[PDB]
């Protein structure tokens, strides 16, 4: 019963399964390690059936649902053991959500036909306020200010949350019992986005103090602090490698961080209307880059506050392709509310025609790893699904899903089924107010809940 | 926690070794003793501790590296 024999037994069994499903055997085995080669190998954009997606909206009591994180077990080719923490949790999908009401909630989403079913929750409050008022003493078990982000560890054993309280609490997935609390140890170190390195325990946290902090959850210890952004680091993303990317919000710069080489690549949009109008011979200037997701180890996409969805490549500093006003323009302000004057024509003038119109912001943007499809979210009332061209030089609008109504704070995708036939479930957190703040005017029909949509492949 | 990163790795079969630049990040710690560094490099590169040698270490001004 040597360990080399055990791998041999599992290895032979795994081949037996592939033979049953079926060149093809050789082809699949390459795909098993295609992840290591940082290139897109999941070309399933055409095969998706957006029109037939089964959409549903599930209401939640928590006000202003702020973020959602999904955990999917993955069978590990090296050891042929599932990523599930324990024996009880085979093939179970979990989704964790956090809200401004200081409540963390876990859901089960294994049954695609059924709605998320709450299992356990932990809620914070004023009980946990620190008395010491020193940053290194901010080590209370529960939250006391708005929770902004949540991420589920790839090993399925921990889920970590952070918010405006300047703390990084890591919970036990089984019980949602806090096991360790890591202060960011800065006056303005408010955590804004969390991402795990795929299939690893390393965590990258973006803080409002203009720095990215890195952690190793298994050791419960901080590793490094990265510097260089010119404004707050609103969002961060990561993949199998250590190349995390970040967007600095108003500084209008996206930076890729090579943690081993200790170097960073700076990318800037640098688009100006006078040329764009000249090239044409409504264009709005970008104000911030708020969201980011890495399509690939050599590509990533960003969404700005002028409705621009940009595709980037590591080689080129400028965007390779841009999709201006992706979500359209906001509704015009009502003429009965613009001015108090009695005459209608007087009120119409204050609208100033079309100069006051502004575009939707890209509140959420998610790309399936190593695929040619990504999902963009805003409060236009629909989730748009895009497809990146085969040459990875442009993307087009695959389809839309109109079920979601409200501000899409975060998007996630979870998949099930055999390798050939695969069903994707799109889970999006919907809130009445933007995650960072309450700027946005209330959207009619918005509700706090978890938007869900199941999409099936056929061909 | 303390991190070790190797860079500029050159394999020198003439002397039968691998030479590299070692960067130690040690927040909240004076520095790492050469023996401990030898143990960690040894297990990382899958060689005996006797076969690992480190020298020429200068802590960067302000500490932490």
């Amino acid at each position: 019963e040597n360990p080399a024999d055990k791998r041999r037994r599992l290895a032979k069994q795994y081949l037996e399964n592939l033979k049953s499903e079926a060149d093809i055997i050789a082809s699949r085995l390459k795909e098993d390690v295609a992840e290591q080669q940082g290139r897109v190998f999941r070309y399933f954009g055409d095969k998706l059936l957006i029109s037939e997606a089964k959409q549903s909206f599930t209401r939640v009591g928590e006000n202003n649902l702020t973020c959602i994180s999904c955990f999917q077990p993955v069978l590990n080719k090296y050891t042929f053991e599932e990523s599930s923490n324990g024996d009880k949790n085979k093939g179970r999908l979990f989704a964790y959500t956090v809200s401004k009401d200081l409540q963390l909630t876990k859901y089960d989403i294994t049954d695609f036909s059924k709605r998320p079913k709450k299992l356990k929750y932990a809620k914070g409050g004023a009980k946990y306020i620190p008395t010491s008022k020193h940053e290194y003493e901010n080590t209370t078990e529960g939250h006391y200010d708005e929770i902004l982000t949540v991420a589920a560890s790839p090993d399925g054993k921990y889920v970590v949350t952070g918010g405006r309280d300047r703390k990084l609490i890591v919970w036990s997935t089984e019980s949602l019992s806090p096991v360790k609390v890591i202060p960011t140890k800065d006056r303005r170190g408010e955590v804004l986005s969390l991402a795990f390195r795929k299939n690893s325990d390393q965590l990258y946290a973006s803080c409002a103090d203009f720095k990215i902090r890195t952690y190793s959850i298994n050791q419960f210890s901080q590793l490094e602090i990265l510097y260089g952004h010119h404004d707050i680091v609103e969002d961060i993303s990561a993949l199998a490698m250590e190349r995390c990317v970040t967007v600095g919000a108003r500084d209008r710069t996206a930076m890729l961080w090579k943690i081993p080489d200790e170097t960073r690549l700076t990318f800037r949009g640098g688009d100006e209307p006078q040329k764009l109008l000249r090239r044409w011979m409504l264009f709005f200037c970008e104000g911030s880059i708020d969201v980011v997701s890495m399509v690939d180890d050599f590509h990533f996409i960003t969404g700005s506050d002028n409705g621009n969805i940009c595709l980037w490549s590591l080689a080129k500093k400028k965007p390779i392709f841009t999709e201006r006003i992706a979500h359209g323009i906001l509704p015009e302000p009502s003429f009965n509310d613009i001015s108090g004057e009695t005459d209608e024509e007087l009120r119409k003038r204050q609208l100033q025609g079309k100069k006051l119109l502004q575009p939707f912001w890209i509140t959420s943007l998610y790309a399936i790893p190593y695929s040619n499809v990504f999902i963009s979210g805003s409060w236009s009332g629909s989730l748009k699904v895009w497809k990146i061209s085969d040459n990875l030089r442009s993307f087009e609008l695959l389809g839309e899903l109109s079920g979601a109504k409200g501000v899409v704070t975060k998007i996630q995708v979870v998949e099930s089924g055999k390798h050939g036939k695969e069903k994707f479930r799109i889970l999006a957190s919907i809130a009445k107010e933007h995650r960072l703040g309450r700027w946005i005017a209330n959207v009619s029909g918005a509700r706090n809940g978890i938007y869900s949509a199941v999409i099936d492949q056929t061909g | 926690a303390v991190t070790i990163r190797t860079r500029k790795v050159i394999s020198n079969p003439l002397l039968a070794r691998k030479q590299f630049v070692v960067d130690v990040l040690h927040p909240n710690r004076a520095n790492v003793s050469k023996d401990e560094l030898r143990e960690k490099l040894a297990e990382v590169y899958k060689a005996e501790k006797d076969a690992v040698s480190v020298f020429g270490f200068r802590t960067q001004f302000g500490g932490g590296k």
């Binding site: 210890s221 250590e242 | 926690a1 303390v2 991190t3 190797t6 790795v9 960690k40 990382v44």
Partner: peptide, 8 residues
């Protein structure tokens, strides 16, 4: 390319 580790 080199290798990476963290301890303690």
């Amino acid at each position: 390319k080199g290798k990476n580790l963290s301890f303690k």
